[PDB]
Amino acid sequence: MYKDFANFIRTNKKDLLNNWMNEMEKQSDPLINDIAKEPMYEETSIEFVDLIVSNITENGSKFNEKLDDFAEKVVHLGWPIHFVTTGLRVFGLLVYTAMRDEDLFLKREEKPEDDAYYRFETWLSSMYNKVVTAYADTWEKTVSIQKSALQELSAPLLPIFEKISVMPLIGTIDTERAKLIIENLLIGVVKNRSEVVLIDITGVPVVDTMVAHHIIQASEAVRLVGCQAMLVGIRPEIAQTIVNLGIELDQIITTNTMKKGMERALALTNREIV
Amino acid sequence: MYKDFANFIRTNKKDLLNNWMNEMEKQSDPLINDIAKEPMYEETSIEFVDLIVSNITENGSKFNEKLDDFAEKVVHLGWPIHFVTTGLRVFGLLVYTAMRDEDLFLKREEKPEDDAYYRFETWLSSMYNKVVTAYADTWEKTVSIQKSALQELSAPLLPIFEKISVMPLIGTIDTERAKLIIENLLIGVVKNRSEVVLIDITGVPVVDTMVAHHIIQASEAVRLVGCQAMLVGIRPEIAQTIVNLGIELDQIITTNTMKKGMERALALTNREIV
Amino acid sequence: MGIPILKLGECLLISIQSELDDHTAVEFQEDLLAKIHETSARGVVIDITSIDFIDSFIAKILGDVVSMSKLMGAKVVVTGIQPAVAITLIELGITFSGVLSAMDLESGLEKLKQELGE
Amino acid sequence: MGIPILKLGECLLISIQSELDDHTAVEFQEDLLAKIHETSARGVVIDITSIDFIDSFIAKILGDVVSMSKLMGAKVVVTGIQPAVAITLIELGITFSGVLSAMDLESGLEKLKQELGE
C-alpha cells in the first residue's frame, strides 16, 4: 500500500525539510552549510524520498539507479555512513513528532492503531536497507581492485638484461607480501632464463624477522634453481634484523648500489662485461 | 537513565534470541549457520545489548572498546552494513511485539506514553550510529594507507645502472597515476644524473588516449631536460592508440624488449659498451 | 624399467619421470650406485625436471645419492628443482647439494665438460 | 664525539679510543652504519689498538658490526686485538671476524688496496 503512503509523504516532505534544518545545526554545521545549500539539499532529499513511494509496493529500477547515485554522491560529498545514520535517526524522530501532530495514516479512521504505526517503520527500515546496500555494493569492489593492483605491483621481474634478471621491491612487505614476492620471483626465474638475480631491497624501511628469514630462504632456493641471488642495497636496520636472526650468511653476495650489483653480475658472467 | 532499560533488557535478551532465530530464515542462512555456531552469536549479541545500558546514561570505556570490537567483528565476519540494518529492522519488529505484549517501559506507570516508547528507538539509533562510526574509521584508515602504498609503488626509478636509469611500470594506469608517474620521472631524473631513461610500457594492457598523451609529453620533456627517453616494450594496442592519437612520432626512440633497449643505451654512450 | 641411465663421453645421464616415493627411491639409489660402480664415470648428471612433488623421504634419498656420488665422482644435478619442490627441499634438506645448472641440461653438460677439461 | 670516522681512497678508517661498553658500542655501531649507508665505501677499516679489555657485550657488538658491514661492503679488523682481548673474544665470540692484517694499520690499508685492485 504505497498510494496513501505516497499521499502522506507528499505532506511529510516539509517535515523532512524541517528535520534537515534541525539536523544541520548539530554535526559539522559549517561543513554541511558549505558542501550543500538549502534549496539543493531540499530538492535532492524530496526527490530521493518521493520516487519510491510511487512504485507499486516492490521497487523502482530508475529509483534504484537514482538511489545508488544518491548514496555515492552523499558518501563522496561529506555525508558518510555515520551522517546517513544520524539522518535516519532524525527522520524517525521528526516523523514521530509529525504523527503526534498530524496523525494521518494509511487506513483512514478516527484513530488508526499500531499496525500501520510499525508498517511505517518497516518501510523506513527497508528504505535504509536499500541505501546501505547501495553504499556497500561497490566499495568492496574497489577495495578488491586496489588489492589486486597492490599484489600485481609486488615483484616485477620484467626488468631483464642479457642473461641477467633483476627484481626491484620498494614497498613495505608482510608475511603475505613476502610469500607473494618469493612465489613471483621463483615463477619468473623458472619461466625465463637467467644466471644471476638481483633483489633491490633498497626502499623497504624495516622488515620483520620472519620476513628476513623468508628472504634468505628465497635467496638460497633461487641459488638452488641455478641462479645466484645478489641482495643489492640492504639498509642498516634490515642488516641488524638479519644478523640478530642468526642464520648463516656466507652465500649471499651483497652490494650497496645497483650499479655495483650490475658490474658484479657482469663480472660473474665473464664475457658479458664486453 | 539506563537502569530500567537494563531491567527490561532482562527479558529483551530472550526476545532478541527469538529475533535472531527469526532472522535466520531470510539472509545468509547456510553461511551464518556454518561459519558461526548459534550459541556464540547469541551470547555475543545478548552481551552487546545488555552491557550498553549498564552504565549511568553512558557507556564505559571498556564497553566502548568492546563495542568497537563487536562492530569490526560483525563487519569482517559476514554481517555487512546491510545485515546490520536488517538486524536493526528485526530488532524493531521483536521489541515492538514485546512492547505490545509485555508492556514494560522506562517510567513506572500504568501505561507510559510515547515518550519512552520512542526513547527506546532513539537509543537504538544511537547504538547504530556508534556501530557505523566504528565501521567507517578503520576502513577509511586502511583505504588511505593502501592508496599511499599505490602512490609510492607507481613509478619506481630506483632501478639504476651506471649513468643509465630505467623506470619499469606495470598494471593499469589512469590519469592521476599518469600525473604521478610523470612527476616522479622528472624529479628522479633531476635527482640523479642519467643520459638515457628507459621507461617500460610492457605490463599495461590498454592505455587511454589522455594517458598516452601524457606519456608522450613526459618523454619529450625528459628529452628537453637533456636525457633521451627510449620508450621500450610498447604493446601493439598501445602503439595503435598512439598512432591514432595523431601527434608527430619521429622524436621518440622505441625498442621491443628491455635487453635491446639497454644495448641501444650502451650504443648511445659510445664508450660504455664495456 | 623407469630409470634410463645413459652413457656418453665417459660421463653419465639419468632422467626421472616417475615421481614415486619408495620403490623409485630405493631402485634409483642402488641402481645408480651399481652403474657408477661398474664403469668409471667422472660426472653423473641427474635429471629432475619432470618431478613436481617432493616429500621429506625423497629429499633425503636425493641428498644421500648426491653425497654418495661425490664420494665416488663429482656430479651435477643439472635440473633446477621446481620452485615448490625447491623450497620443499630447502626447508628440511639444508645442504648445498652439489652443483646445479638452471634447468638447462645443455648448461650442465657444458659445465661438466669445462670442469673435466682442466 | 668519540667515534672518529675518516674517509680516504674509497675506504673508511675508524679508531676506537673509548674502552667503554654500552655507549661506545651503540653509538659507534649506529654511526658506522649510517656512514657506510649514506656514503658508498667498498672497504672499511677498524682500529682496536687502544682497547685492552672486552666483555661479552662488546664482542657481540663487533660481531654484529662485521656481519653488517660485510652485508654492505668489504671489512677488516685491521688492528690485531690484544692477547687478553684475543682469548676473551675467541672464548665467547667464536667468529673468524673476516680477515685482518696483524695490527699494522697500513698493512690493512694495502690489503684493501690490493683486494680493490682486482
TrEMBL record, chains A, B:
<dbReference type="InterPro" id="IPR012292">
    <property type="entry name" value="Globin/Proto"/>
</dbReference>
<protein>
    <submittedName>
        <fullName>RsbR protein</fullName>
    </submittedName>
</protein>
<keyword id="KW-0597">Phosphoprotein</keyword>
<dbReference type="InterPro" id="IPR051932">
    <property type="entry name" value="Bact_StressResp_Reg"/>
</dbReference>
<feature type="modified residue" description="Phosphothreonine">
    <location>
        <position position="241"/>
    </location>
</feature>
<dbReference type="InterPro" id="IPR014792">
    <property type="entry name" value="RsbRA_N"/>
</dbReference>
<dbReference type="Pfam" id="PF01740">
    <property type="entry name" value="STAS"/>
</dbReference>
<dbReference type="InterPro" id="IPR002645">
    <property type="entry name" value="STAS_dom"/>
</dbReference>
<dbReference type="InterPro" id="IPR036513">
    <property type="entry name" value="STAS_dom_sf"/>
</dbReference>
<dbReference type="Pfam" id="PF08678">
    <property type="entry name" value="Rsbr_N"/>
</dbReference>
<feature type="modified residue" description="Phosphothreonine">
    <location>
        <position position="175"/>
    </location>
</feature>
<dbReference type="GO" id="GO:0020037">
    <property type="term" value="F:heme binding"/>
</dbReference>
<dbReference type="GO" id="GO:0019825">
    <property type="term" value="F:oxygen binding"/>
</dbReference>
<feature type="domain" description="STAS">
    <location>
        <begin position="154"/>
        <end position="269"/>
    </location>
</feature>
Automatic annotation (TrEMBL), chains C, D:
<dbReference type="Pfam" id="PF01740">
    <property type="entry name" value="STAS"/>
</dbReference>
<dbReference type="InterPro" id="IPR051932">
    <property type="entry name" value="Bact_StressResp_Reg"/>
</dbReference>
<dbReference type="InterPro" id="IPR036513">
    <property type="entry name" value="STAS_dom_sf"/>
</dbReference>
<feature type="domain" description="STAS">
    <location>
        <begin position="12"/>
        <end position="112"/>
    </location>
</feature>
<dbReference type="InterPro" id="IPR002645">
    <property type="entry name" value="STAS_dom"/>
</dbReference>
<protein>
    <submittedName>
        <fullName>RsbS protein</fullName>
    </submittedName>
</protein>
